[PDB]
Coordinates of all heavy atoms in Angstrom, one line a residue:
Chain A
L32 N -38.1 -123.6 -65.4 CA -39.4 -123.3 -64.7 C -40.5 -124.1 -65.3 O -41.6 -123.7 -65.6 CB -39.7 -121.8 -64.8 CG -38.7 -120.8 -64.4 CD1 -39.0 -119.4 -64.9 CD2 -38.6 -120.8 -62.9
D65 N -45.6 -117.5 -60.1 CA -45.3 -116.8 -58.8 C -46.5 -116.0 -58.4 O -46.6 -114.8 -58.9 CB -44.1 -116.0 -58.9 CG -43.7 -115.3 -57.6 OD1 -43.8 -116.0 -56.5 OD2 -43.4 -114.1 -57.6
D70 N -41.2 -111.7 -51.8 CA -39.8 -111.6 -51.6 C -39.2 -110.4 -52.3 O -38.7 -109.5 -51.6 CB -39.1 -112.9 -52.1 CG -38.9 -113.9 -51.0 OD1 -39.0 -113.5 -49.8 OD2 -38.5 -115.0 -51.4
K71 N -39.3 -110.3 -53.6 CA -38.7 -109.2 -54.3 C -39.5 -107.9 -54.1 O -40.4 -107.6 -54.8 CB -38.6 -109.5 -55.8 CG -37.9 -110.8 -56.1 CD -36.4 -110.7 -55.9 CE -35.6 -112.0 -56.1 NZ -35.7 -112.9 -55.0
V74 N -37.2 -104.4 -55.7 CA -36.4 -104.8 -56.8 C -37.2 -104.8 -58.1 O -38.2 -105.3 -58.1 CB -35.8 -106.2 -56.5 CG1 -34.6 -106.4 -57.5 CG2 -35.3 -106.3 -55.1
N75 N -36.7 -104.1 -59.1 CA -37.4 -103.9 -60.3 C -37.3 -105.1 -61.2 O -36.5 -106.0 -60.9 CB -36.8 -102.7 -61.1 CG -37.1 -101.4 -60.4 OD1 -38.2 -101.2 -59.9 ND2 -36.1 -100.5 -60.4
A76 N -38.1 -105.2 -62.2 CA -38.0 -106.3 -63.1 C -38.3 -105.8 -64.5 O -39.0 -104.8 -64.7 CB -38.9 -107.5 -62.7
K77 N -37.8 -106.5 -65.5 CA -38.1 -106.2 -66.9 C -38.7 -107.4 -67.6 O -38.3 -108.5 -67.5 CB -36.7 -105.9 -67.6 CG -36.8 -105.1 -68.8 CD -35.4 -104.7 -69.4 CE -34.7 -106.0 -69.9 NZ -35.4 -106.6 -71.0
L93 N -42.8 -113.4 -68.8 CA -41.5 -113.8 -68.1 C -40.8 -112.5 -67.7 O -40.8 -111.5 -68.4 CB -40.6 -114.6 -69.0 CG -39.3 -115.0 -68.5 CD1 -39.4 -115.9 -67.3 CD2 -38.5 -115.6 -69.6
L94 N -40.3 -112.5 -66.4 CA -39.7 -111.3 -65.8 C -38.2 -111.7 -65.5 O -38.0 -112.7 -64.8 CB -40.4 -110.9 -64.6 CG -41.8 -110.4 -64.7 CD1 -42.5 -110.4 -63.3 CD2 -41.9 -109.1 -65.4
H95 N -37.3 -110.8 -66.0 CA -35.9 -110.8 -65.5 C -35.8 -109.8 -64.4 O -36.0 -108.6 -64.7 CB -35.0 -110.5 -66.6 CG -34.9 -111.5 -67.7 ND1 -35.4 -112.8 -67.6 CD2 -34.3 -111.4 -68.9 CE1 -35.1 -113.4 -68.7 NE2 -34.5 -112.7 -69.5
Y96 N -35.5 -110.2 -63.2 CA -35.3 -109.3 -62.1 C -33.9 -108.6 -62.3 O -33.1 -109.0 -63.2 CB -35.3 -109.9 -60.8 CG -36.7 -110.1 -60.3 CD1 -37.5 -111.2 -60.6 CD2 -37.4 -109.1 -59.6 CE1 -38.8 -111.4 -60.2 CE2 -38.7 -109.2 -59.2 CZ -39.4 -110.4 -59.5 OH -40.7 -110.5 -59.1
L97 N -33.6 -107.6 -61.6 CA -32.3 -106.9 -61.7 C -31.3 -107.7 -60.8 O -30.1 -107.4 -61.0 CB -32.4 -105.5 -61.2 CG -33.0 -104.5 -62.2 CD1 -32.8 -103.0 -61.8 CD2 -32.6 -104.6 -63.7
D98 N -31.7 -108.6 -60.0 CA -30.7 -109.4 -59.2 C -30.2 -110.5 -60.1 O -29.1 -111.0 -59.9 CB -31.4 -110.0 -58.0 CG -32.1 -109.0 -57.1 OD1 -31.6 -107.8 -57.1 OD2 -33.1 -109.3 -56.5
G99 N -31.0 -111.1 -61.0 CA -30.6 -112.2 -61.8 C -31.6 -113.3 -61.7 O -31.3 -114.4 -62.3
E100 N -32.6 -113.2 -60.9 CA -33.7 -114.2 -60.9 C -34.6 -114.0 -62.1 O -34.6 -112.9 -62.7 CB -34.6 -114.1 -59.7 CG -34.1 -114.7 -58.4 CD -35.2 -115.2 -57.5 OE1 -36.4 -114.9 -57.8 OE2 -34.9 -115.8 -56.5
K101 N -35.3 -115.1 -62.5 CA -36.2 -115.1 -63.6 C -37.4 -115.8 -63.1 O -37.3 -116.9 -62.5 CB -35.6 -115.8 -64.8 CG -34.4 -115.0 -65.4 CD -33.9 -115.6 -66.7 CE -33.2 -116.9 -66.4 NZ -32.6 -117.5 -67.7
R102 N -38.6 -115.3 -63.4 CA -39.8 -115.9 -63.0 C -41.0 -115.4 -63.8 O -41.0 -114.3 -64.3 CB -40.1 -115.8 -61.5 CG -39.9 -114.4 -61.0 CD -40.2 -114.4 -59.5 NE -39.3 -115.2 -58.7 CZ -39.3 -115.2 -57.3 NH1 -40.1 -114.4 -56.6 NH2 -38.5 -116.0 -56.7
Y103 N -42.1 -116.2 -63.8 CA -43.3 -116.0 -64.5 C -44.4 -115.2 -63.7 O -44.3 -115.2 -62.5 CB -43.9 -117.3 -65.0 CG -43.3 -118.0 -66.2 CD1 -42.7 -119.2 -66.1 CD2 -43.3 -117.3 -67.4 CE1 -42.1 -119.8 -67.2 CE2 -42.7 -117.9 -68.5 CZ -42.1 -119.1 -68.4 OH -41.5 -119.7 -69.5
Chain D
rG271 P -29.8 -110.4 -52.8 OP1 -30.4 -109.0 -53.0 OP2 -29.7 -111.0 -51.5 O5' -30.5 -111.4 -53.8 C5' -30.1 -112.8 -53.7 C4' -30.7 -113.5 -54.9 O4' -30.2 -113.0 -56.1 C3' -30.2 -115.0 -55.0 O3' -31.0 -115.8 -54.2 C2' -30.4 -115.3 -56.5 O2' -31.7 -115.5 -56.8 C1' -29.9 -114.0 -57.1 N9 -28.5 -113.9 -57.3 C8 -27.5 -113.1 -56.7 N7 -26.3 -113.3 -57.2 C5 -26.5 -114.3 -58.1 C6 -25.5 -115.0 -58.8 O6 -24.3 -114.8 -58.9 N1 -26.1 -116.0 -59.6 C2 -27.4 -116.3 -59.7 N2 -27.7 -117.3 -60.5 N3 -28.3 -115.7 -58.9 C4 -27.8 -114.7 -58.2
rG272 P -30.3 -116.8 -53.1 OP1 -31.3 -117.3 -52.2 OP2 -29.1 -116.2 -52.6 O5' -29.8 -118.1 -54.0 C5' -30.8 -118.8 -54.7 C4' -30.1 -119.9 -55.6 O4' -29.5 -119.3 -56.7 C3' -28.9 -120.6 -54.9 O3' -29.4 -121.7 -54.0 C2' -28.1 -121.1 -56.1 O2' -28.6 -122.3 -56.6 C1' -28.3 -120.0 -57.1 N9 -27.2 -119.1 -57.1 C8 -27.0 -117.9 -56.4 N7 -25.9 -117.3 -56.7 C5 -25.3 -118.1 -57.6 C6 -24.0 -118.0 -58.3 O6 -23.2 -117.1 -58.2 N1 -23.8 -119.0 -59.2 C2 -24.6 -120.1 -59.4 N2 -24.2 -121.0 -60.3 N3 -25.8 -120.2 -58.8 C4 -26.0 -119.2 -57.9
rC279 P -20.2 -119.7 -67.0 OP1 -20.3 -120.2 -68.4 OP2 -19.7 -118.4 -66.7 O5' -21.7 -119.8 -66.3 C5' -22.6 -120.8 -66.8 C4' -24.0 -120.5 -66.2 O4' -23.9 -120.6 -64.8 C3' -24.6 -119.1 -66.5 O3' -25.2 -119.0 -67.8 C2' -25.6 -119.0 -65.4 O2' -26.8 -119.8 -65.7 C1' -24.9 -119.7 -64.2 N1 -24.2 -118.7 -63.4 C2 -24.9 -117.9 -62.5 O2 -26.2 -118.2 -62.5 N3 -24.4 -117.0 -61.8 C4 -23.1 -116.8 -61.8 N4 -22.6 -115.8 -61.1 C5 -22.2 -117.5 -62.7 C6 -22.8 -118.4 -63.5
rG280 P -25.4 -117.5 -68.4 OP1 -26.1 -117.7 -69.7 OP2 -24.2 -116.8 -68.3 O5' -26.4 -116.9 -67.3 C5' -27.8 -117.1 -67.4 C4' -28.6 -116.2 -66.5 O4' -28.1 -116.3 -65.2 C3' -28.6 -114.7 -66.8 O3' -29.5 -114.4 -67.8 C2' -28.9 -114.1 -65.4 O2' -30.3 -114.2 -65.1 C1' -28.1 -115.1 -64.5 N9 -26.8 -114.6 -64.2 C8 -25.7 -115.1 -64.9 N7 -24.5 -114.6 -64.5 C5 -24.9 -113.7 -63.5 C6 -24.2 -112.9 -62.7 O6 -22.9 -112.7 -62.7 N1 -24.9 -112.1 -61.8 C2 -26.3 -112.2 -61.7 N2 -26.9 -111.5 -60.7 N3 -27.0 -113.0 -62.4 C4 -26.3 -113.7 -63.3
rU281 P -29.3 -113.0 -68.6 OP1 -30.5 -112.8 -69.5 OP2 -28.0 -113.2 -69.3 O5' -29.2 -111.9 -67.6 C5' -30.4 -111.4 -66.9 C4' -30.1 -110.3 -66.0 O4' -29.2 -110.7 -64.9 C3' -29.4 -109.1 -66.6 O3' -30.3 -108.2 -67.3 C2' -28.8 -108.4 -65.4 O2' -29.7 -107.7 -64.6 C1' -28.3 -109.6 -64.6 N1 -26.9 -110.0 -65.0 C2 -25.9 -109.4 -64.4 O2 -26.0 -108.6 -63.5 N3 -24.6 -109.8 -64.8 C4 -24.4 -110.7 -65.8 O4 -23.2 -111.0 -66.1 C5 -25.5 -111.3 -66.4 C6 -26.7 -110.9 -66.0

Side-chain angles (χ1 to χ4, degrees):
Chain A
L32 307 162
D65 180 45
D70 263 349
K71 303 288 178 283
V74 194
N75 293 318
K77 202 176 69 60
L93 179 63
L94 297 166
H95 292 349
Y96 279 87
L97 284 192
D98 308 330
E100 277 208 357
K101 295 187 287 185
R102 46 176 64 172
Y103 281 118

